Amino acid sequence: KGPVDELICRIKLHEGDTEFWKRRFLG
């Protein structure tokens, strides 16, 4: 809605990464 250490670079999105979500499902 807009008209520094920039830590945002380490925020990793795992959309579509099936293997990533299976690990969290297991634990």
Partner 1 sequence: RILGIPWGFLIGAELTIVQSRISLVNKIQKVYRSQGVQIHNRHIEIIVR
Catalog residues that contact partner 1 under the rule CB under 8 A.
14-17, 20-21, 24-25
Min dist. Cβ of residue 14 to partner 1 (A): 6
Q: Say whether 23 sits in a helix, a strand or coil.
A: helix
Tell me which residue has tokens 């499902």: 25
Min dist. Cβ of residue 4 to partner 1 (A): 27
Nearer to partner 1, 5 or 12 (CB): 12
Min dist. Cβ of residue 24 to partner 1 (A): 6
Where does residue 8 fall: left (phi above 0), alpha (psi -120 to 50 degrees), or beta otherwise? alpha
